[PDB]
Amino acid sequence: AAFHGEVVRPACTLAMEDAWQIIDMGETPVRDLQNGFSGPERKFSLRLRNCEFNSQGGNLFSDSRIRVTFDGVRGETPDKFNLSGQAKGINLQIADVRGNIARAGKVMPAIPLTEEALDYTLRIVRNGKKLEAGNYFAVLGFRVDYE
Amino acid sequence: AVSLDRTRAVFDGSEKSMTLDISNDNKQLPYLAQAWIENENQEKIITGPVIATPPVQRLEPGAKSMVRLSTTPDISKLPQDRESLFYFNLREIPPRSEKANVLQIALQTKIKLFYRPAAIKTRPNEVWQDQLILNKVSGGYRIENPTPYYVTVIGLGGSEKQAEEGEFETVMLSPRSEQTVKSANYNTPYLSYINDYGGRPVLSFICNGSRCSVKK
Numbered sequence: 001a002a003f004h005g006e007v008v009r010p011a012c013t014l015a016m017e018d019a020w021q022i023i024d025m026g027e028t029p030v031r032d033l034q035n036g037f038s039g040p041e042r043k044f045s046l047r048l049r050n051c052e053f054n055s056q057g058g059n060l061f062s063d064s065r066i067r068v069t070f071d072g073v074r075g076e077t078p079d080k081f082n083l084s085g086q087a088k089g090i091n092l093q094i095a096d097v098r099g100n101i102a103r104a105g106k107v108m109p110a111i112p113l114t115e116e117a118l119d120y121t122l123r124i125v126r127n128g129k130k131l132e133a134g135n136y137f138a139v140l141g142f143r144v145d146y147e
Numbered sequence: 148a149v150s151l152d153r154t155r156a157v158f159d160g161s162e163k164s165m166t167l168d169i170s171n172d173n174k175q176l177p178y179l180a181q182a183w184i185e186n187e188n189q190e191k192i193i194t195g196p197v198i199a200t201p202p203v204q205r206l207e208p209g210a211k212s213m214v215r216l217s218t219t220p221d222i223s224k225l226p227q228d229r230e231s232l233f234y235f236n237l238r239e240i241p242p243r244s245e246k247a248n249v250l251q252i253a254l255q256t257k258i259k260l261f262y263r264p265a266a267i268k269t270r271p272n273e274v275w276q277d278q279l280i281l282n283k284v285s286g287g288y289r290i291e292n293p294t295p296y297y298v299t300v301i302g303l304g305g306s307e308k309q310a311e312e313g314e315f316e317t318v319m320l321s322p323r324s325e326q327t328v329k330s331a332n333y334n335t336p337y338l339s340y341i342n343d344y345g346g347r348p349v350l351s352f353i354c355n356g357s358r359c360s361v362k363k
């Protein structure tokens with residue numbers, strides 16, 4: 001149509017495989033942790049829809065047209081997030097597809113994508129305190145700032 | 148789950164309020180939508196001079212709703228000859244699962260909210276971004292924005308394709324200001340910016356020595 005009303009780019013809607021937007025982390029990985037390693041990796045994918053996320057030559061994230069940040073309570077170190085619940089001695093770590101580790105409240109670096117999807121990997125890590133198994137969890141903010 | 152209908156909002160200062168549409172795109176579960184405004188430094192404001200209502204609302208699965216932006220009488224203290232910047236924030240609260248050992252993700256959308264006084268009101272499709280000036284300096288360009296509006300620059304290259312797709316760190320110029328950006332030299336610079344509608348036009352520039360302005 002040559003003549004029509006205003007049409008604007010909508011903001012992205014976030015979609016996950018799980019209806020609750022939850023990632024199952026698994027039982028506290030005590031045996032891994034005591035061996036000195038992190039627990040097993042858990043992948044999660046955040047699909048960003050309705051915002052024409054991909055363009056001929058790139059996409060909103062890689063081109064820095066949106067900026068993404070994981071929000072939460074920082075754990076033992078800048079590279080770590082605190083967890084709630086009965087468990088003790090544990091924190092969470094999140095990494096992008098090139099192994100950049102998220103820090104609470106700090107923008108993720110723009111990288112080319114490998115999908116309308118952003119893919120992250122989480123793992124449970126030690127936090128310096130005495131390990132006590134129990135249940136745990138966290139709610140993390142995934143903040144998308146639009147340029 | 149909860150989404151917003153635009154990537155920036157322009158508040159026309161000739162009116163007292165406007166609405167933004169929102170949606171719970173999850174068709175299975177209810178989500179809460181929290182709304183608030185921040186100032187130009189991304190610090191939260193609450194009593195004015197722009198407010199968002201309702202601050203919290205439940206969205207049934209698949210439900211569509213709105214958030215209203217209103218001004219208070221203190222809006223008249225803002226300058227009337229240039230834009231003022233706010234940020235509009237829409238943060239969801241997902242339904243709590245009491246599932247063991249889970250991480251739950253809650254989206255927050257943060258867009259720019261341009262307060263645009265009546266005295267600088269624009270017509271549909273009006274372009275002021277072609278008034279930008281580029282000045283070659285050591286390592287890049289000093290970009291001048293002489294206009295009353297914020298201008299968000301997203302590309303600068305030697306061709307239209309490089310402007311659209313080349314690596315460039317987004318910069319936003321305040322009304323009547325200037326900022327230097329790191330850049331290679333371009334014989335005929337092309338510059339890309341984001342307009343009121345989320346579109347990304349490209350401008351073609353011609354240079355006389357170090358100074359460049361849009362091709363007439």
Ligand SMILES: O=C(O)[C@H](Cc1ccccc1)n1c(SO)c(C2CC2)c(Cc2cccc3ccccc23)cc1=O
Pocket residue numbers: 177178179203204205240241242243
């Ligand atoms: O406690 C909770 O987990 C839930 C969160 C929730 C609610 C609906 C869908 C998904 C998640 N909660 C929440 S979320 O913590 C709130 C809002 C934060 C304040 C309210 C109060 C409330 C809910 C909906 C509309 C309201 C309107 C005016 C005032 C309070 C409202 C009641 C309430 O039960």
Ligand SMILES: [Co+2]
Pocket residue numbers: 001002004
């Ligand atoms: Co058209």
